[PDB]
Amino acid sequence: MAKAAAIGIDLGTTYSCVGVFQHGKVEIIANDQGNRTTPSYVAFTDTERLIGDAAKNQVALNPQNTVFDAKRLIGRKFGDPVVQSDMKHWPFQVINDGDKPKVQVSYKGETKAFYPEEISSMVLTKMKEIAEAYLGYPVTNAVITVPAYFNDSQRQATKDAGVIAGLNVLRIINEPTAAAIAYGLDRTGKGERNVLIFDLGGGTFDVSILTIDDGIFEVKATAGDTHLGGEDFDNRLVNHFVEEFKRKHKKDISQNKRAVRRLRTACERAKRTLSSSTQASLEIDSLFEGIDFYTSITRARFEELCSDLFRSTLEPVEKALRDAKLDKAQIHDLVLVGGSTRIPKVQKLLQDFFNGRDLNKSINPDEAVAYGAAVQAAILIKSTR
Numbered sequence: 001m002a003k004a005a006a007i008g009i010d011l012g013t014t015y016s017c018v019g020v021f022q023h024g025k026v027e028i029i030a031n032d033q034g035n036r037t038t039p040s041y042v043a044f045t046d047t048e049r050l051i052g053d054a055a056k057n058q059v060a061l062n063p064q065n066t067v068f069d070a071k072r073l074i075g076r077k078f079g080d081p082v083v084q085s086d087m088k089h090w091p092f093q094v095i096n097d098g099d100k101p102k103v104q105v106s107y108k109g110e111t112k113a114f115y116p117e118e119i120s121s122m123v124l125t126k127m128k129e130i131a132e133a134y135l136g137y138p139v140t141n142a143v144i145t146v147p148a149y150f151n152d153s154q155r156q157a158t159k160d161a162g163v164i165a166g167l168n169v170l171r172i173i174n175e176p177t178a179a180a181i182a183y184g185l186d187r188t189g190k191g192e193r194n195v196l197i198f199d200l201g202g203g204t205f206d207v208s209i210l211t212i213d214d215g216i217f218e219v220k221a222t223a224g225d226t227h228l229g230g231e232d233f234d235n236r237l238v239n240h241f242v243e244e245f246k247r248k249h250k251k252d253i254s255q256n257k258r259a260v261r262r263l264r265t266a267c268e269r270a271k272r273t274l275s276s277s278t279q280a281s282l283e284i285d286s287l288f289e290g291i292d293f294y295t296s297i298t299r300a301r302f303e304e305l306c307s308d309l310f311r312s313t314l315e316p317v318e319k320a321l322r323d324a325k326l327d328k329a330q331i332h333d334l335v336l337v338g339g340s341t342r343i344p345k346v347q348k349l350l351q352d353f354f355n356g357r358d359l360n361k362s363i364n365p366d367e368a369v370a371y372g373a374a375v376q377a378a379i380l381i382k383s384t385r
C-alpha cells in the first residue's frame with residue numbers, strides 16, 4: 001500500500017513539482033490551490049511559517065523573512081565565491097556558522113537561523129503533504145532530482161533535506177536523466193543515443209548532453225548560465241512598460257516599489273499569454289497616482305525586447321557540443337525542460353540551430369523532470385519489493 005508507493009520530486013530553484021506513477025500513468029499532483037508546480041519559498045511571519053504559493057504571495061510585504069534560492073546555498077561553504085556574490089542580491093540575511101551558511105530570519109517575534117537543507121526540507125515536507133492529500137495515505141519513498149553539475153557535497157545535503165522532511169530517499173538522480181526517462185529515451189534498445197536537454201527555468205539556464213548506452217546514462221557535457229531565466233524576460237517587459245508610462249504621463253514609476261511589483265506580476269502573466277497568443281493585454285487599475293495602466297504588447301515587440309537574451313542561449317549549446325566532442329548531426333534527441341521553453345521564439349532558435357529538427361516538448365516542460373523521477377521511483381520501489 002504506502003510501503004509499495006513512491007513519489008518523484010523535482011526540487012527546483014524557483015519551483016518544485018511532485019508526481020506519482022500509478023495504474024500505468026504519471027499524475028502530476030496539483031497543490032490545494034490547484035497548481036501543478038509550487039514556488040520554492042518559505043516565509044516566516046509573526047504567527048506562522050508559510051510554504052509555497054502563500055509564501056510567494058506575501059513576498060512584497062515581508063522581504064527580509066521570505067527565503068528563496070536555498071538550492072544556490074545547499075552543500076556550499078560560506079567562503080565560496082558563488083555564496084558571497086549571491087548574498088549581495090538577497091533581501092534575507094545569510095550568516096556564517098563554522099564556514100557553513102545559515103539564513104537568519106525573524107519568526108514569531110524571535111531571531112532564528114536555518115541551514116539551507118532545513119529550508120529545502122520545509123519545501124520537501126510541503127511536496128510530501130501534497131502527494132499525501134492526493135493519495136489518501138502517507139507516502140515516504142521518494143526520488144529527488146538535482147542538477148547534473150551538483151558535486152557530492154550538494155547531493156548529500158539534498159539527501160539530508162529529504163531525511164529531515166521524513167522521506168526515505170530511494171535515489172538522488174540528475175535532472176537531465178529524469179527528463180530523458182520521461183520521454184522513454186533509455187528504452188530504444190541497443191546502440192549509444194546522444195540526447196541534448198535544453199533546460200530554461202525561472203532563474204537558471206542549463207544545457208546537458210547525455211549518452212544512453214543500453215540503459216546506462218553518461219553525462220558528456222554541462223553548460224549554461226546560472227543567472228539566466230524567465231525572470232530576466234519579465235524585467236525586460238517591466239523596463240519597456242516603465243518607459244511607456246513615462247511617454248504617456250510624463251511620470252517616473254521606477255522608485256515606487258508597489259507600482260513596480262504590480263507591473264512585474266502583470267508582465268509575468270502577459271509573457272505567458274504571449275506563448276499562445278500574438279498579443280497580451282495589461283489591465284492594472286490605479287498603477288501610480290490614480291492612473292490606470294491599460295495597454296497591450298505584441299509577441300513581435302516582446303521578441304525584440306528579449307532578442308539578445310534568447311540568442312545568448314545558443315552559446316552554451318555550442319560550448320556543450322564542443323566539450324562533448326559531438327557535431328549537431330550526432331545528437332539523436334532534443335528535449336525541452338523549464339516553463340520558459342514554451343516561448344515560441346526560443347523553440348524556433350533552437351530548431352533552426354539544429355537544422356530544422358523536431359523537438360521533444362509533448363510533456364509540460366515545467367513537469368518533465370518530476371514525471372521521469374516518478375517513473376524511476378516506481379521502478380526502484382518495485383525492485384525493493
Ligand SMILES: Nc1ncnc2c1nc(Cl)n2[C@@H]1O[C@H](CO)[C@@H](O)[C@H]1O
Nearest residue numbers: 201202230231272275338339340342
Ligand atoms: N507559457 C509560458 N510562457 C512563457 N514562460 C512561461 C510559461 N509558463 C511558464 Cl511556467 N513560464 C515561465 O517558466 C518559469 C518557471 O519554469 C517562470 O519564469 C514562468 O514565468
